[PDB]
Amino acid sequence: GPEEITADIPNVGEAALSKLDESGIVYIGAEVTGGDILVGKVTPKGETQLTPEEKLLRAIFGEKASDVKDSSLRVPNGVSGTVIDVQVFTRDGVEKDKRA
Amino acid sequence: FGIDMNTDYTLEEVGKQFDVTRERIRQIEAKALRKLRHPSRSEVLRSFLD
Amino acid sequence: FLKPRLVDIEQVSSTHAKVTLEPLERGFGHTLGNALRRILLSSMPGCAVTEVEIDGVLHEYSTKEGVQEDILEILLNLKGLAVRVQGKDEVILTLNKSGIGPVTAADITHDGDVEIVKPQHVICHLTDENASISMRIKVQRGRGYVPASTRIHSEEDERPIGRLLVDACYSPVERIAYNVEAARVEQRTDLDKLVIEMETNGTIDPEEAIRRAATILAEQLEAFPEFDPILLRPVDDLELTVRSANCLKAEAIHYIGDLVQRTEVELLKTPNLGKKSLTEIKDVLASRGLSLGMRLENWPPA
Amino acid sequence: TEFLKPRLVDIEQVSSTHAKVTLEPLERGFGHTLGNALRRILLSS
Amino acid sequence: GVLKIVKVYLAVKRRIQPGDKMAGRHGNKGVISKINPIEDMPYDENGTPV
Amino acid sequence: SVITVGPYLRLHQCGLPKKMALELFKPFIYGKLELRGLATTIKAAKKMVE
Known part of the structure; x- marks a missing residue:
């Protein structure tokens, strides 16, 4: 399937989703360090094919395992700076997202 | 589940192997997971979830 | 075993002065003097500006229309602004100005403990007739050098992205030099003088600095596991709605x-919690393997 | 703006007339001023 | 194959730390070893450190 | 990495950067961390040093 830039990221706290706008792109002027999510990205991977202990774990804790893997662009480990610019390129004919 | 065992067994199959079958078994599991739900049991497994 | 003391303190400028010490025994001018130089340069109270929120600025790397200074230049200028406070450890000031012309340090609103030593100090210039800049200059007090980079660990929602952190320049002292000349007091074999000529920004009095220096110096001579961690996390970690959290x-x-100690009964009896909020709380708690009416018996340990 | 005092002494002495004493934490640059001002006083006076 | 691209531009500010390389114009290289306090710095009779 | 002096060192030792040593000994750190009981499991150890 097609990948999404959406701000909806499987398995992240509000601290993680804080630095992203509704569309999933980090705000201009927001100071970041390694591990912060700059651009939320998600790619389809279906039927994760788990194992018995994992199946027990999920049924105990009642967690739906997402069909989407987290490809999001995050600040490289160790580098810390302030975002001064954001540019979005879209294929001619694909609908521009909110942020764009 | 399939824990330390080949494949896994339907609730009815588990019922045949337990001689006490059907809805009965479905209840035990529900109360079993429940016992594992509350902490001091669940705190070890909880950290596995990121 | 004569102990020293001070004598005429000669102030030649708002900037710097020469403090002098009469009664000094053989070789003690150096021992006292250099040691005093050390503490003087190193450890001293300072009030250097820390946080600055400006008008339309998200980051220090932009340029504001109407001012020829880059924002980073303006921060660097502010870092060199010398102020002295009395009762407040941290005060926040407000700077406002417009029209064509230089914006000095006297253009800020004057507060109770605010004393501007250099009113002529240039923060930034103004190039256009109608162009205006407002800013909150958050000035706090501290010791030594605290860079802006180490300032973020604690974090704790510095979210107002308009707030640019700046490196802490805390220290009155610029240059300290000590010269010992033989000092002849009326009657005595041979004694030395201590001429400490120091350089300041004016935010600290010579007697005060020289006092605290030896204060600290002598002050050093004074000796010469069960349960879930998740239970101690703040409610904000549950990521509830603002209403429910409040x-x-x-x-x-x-x-x-x-929260896990409270029951549905008890929560519904509160003045502000409806069924929707309770549904949300039960949902988010169940989503992490928790619930209401959970007993942990022993709240709290230490 | 409170200060720092040491908190982990351990005087390790050889024989009797000889001694090696150590002081654990101390603010940056305080070790040299203390060590020196003291050496000066110990030797010269 | 690529639907959309998001380019974020970071501005990082680094000052100086041990391990950095410094040199004059005369072919004299060097690497900063330790960062010394102003206190320990060699100073002239004027009191100005180096 | 780039190297510096450290004259204070004894002949038998060398100054090793904190971050480097952390990344290098990562499995050892995990193992010791869950050896003393500071970490519930290896995952928790990873999350801790991370």
């Missing part, structure tokens, strides 16, 4: 441990 905090529920 309601819980209003009911003295600040942590998850406090």
Whole structure:
């Protein structure tokens, strides 16, 4: 399937989703360090094919395992700076997202 | 589940192997997971979830 | 065993002065003097500006229309602004100005403990007739050098992205030099003088600095596991709605441990919690393997 | 703006007339001023 | 194959730390070893450190 | 990495950067961390040093 830039990221706290706008792109002027999510990205991977202990774990804790893997662009480990610019390129004919 | 065992067994199959079958078994599991739900049991497994 | 003391303090400028010490025994001018130089340069109270929120600025790397200075230049200029406070450890000031012309340090609003030593000091210039800049200059007090980079660990929601952190320049002292000349007091074999000529920004009095220096110097001579961690996380980690969080905090529920003790009955009896909020709380708690009416018996240990 | 005092002494002495004493934490640059001002006083006076 | 691209531009500010390489124009290289306090710095009779 | 002096060192030792040593000994750190009981499991150890 097609990948999404959406701000909806499987398995992240509000601290993680804080630095992203509704569309999933980090705000201009927001100071970041390694591990912060700059651009939320998600790619389809279906039927994760788990194992018995994992199946027990999920049924105990009642967690739906997402069909989407987290490809999001995050600040490289160790580098810390302030975002001064954001540019979005879209294929001619694909609908521009909110942020764009 | 399939824990330390080949494949896994339907609730009815588990019922045949337990001689006490059907809805009965479905209840035990529900109360079993429940016992594992509350902490001091669940705190070890909880950290596995990121 | 004569102990020293001070004598005429000669102030030649708002900037710097020469403090002098009469009664000094053989070789003690150096021992006292250099040691005093050390503490003087190193450890001293300072009030250097820390946080600055400007008008339309998200980051220090932009340029504001109407001012020829880059924002980073303006921060660097502010870092060199010398102020002295009395009763407040941290004060926040407000700078405002417009029209064509230089914006000095006297253009800020004057507060109770605010004393500007250099009113002529240039923060930034103004190039256009109608162009205006407002800013909050958050000035706090500290010792030594505290760079802006080490300032973020604690974090704790510095979210107002318009707030640019700046490196802490805390220290009155610029240059300290000590010269010992033989000092002849009326009657005595041979004694030395201590001429400490120091350089300041004016935010600290010579007697005060020289005092605290030896104060600290002598001051050094003074010796010469069960349960879930998740239970102690703040309620904000549950990521509830603002309403629910505020309601819980209003009911003295600040942590998850406090919440899991409460029952549905008790929560519904609160003045501000409806069925929707309770549904949300039960949902988010169940989503992490928790619930209401959970007993942990022993709240709290230490 | 409170200060720092040491908190982990351990005087390790050889024989009797000889001694090696150590002081654990101390603010940056305080070790040299203390060590020196003291050496000066110990030797010269 | 690529639907959309998001380019974020970071501005990082680094000052100086041990391990950095410094040199004059005369072919004299060097690497900063330790960062010394102003206190320990060699100073002239004027009191100005180096 | 780039190297510096450290004259204070004894002949038998060398100054090793904190971050480097952390990343290098990562499995050892995990193992010791869950050896003393500071970490519930290896995952928790990873999350801790991370």
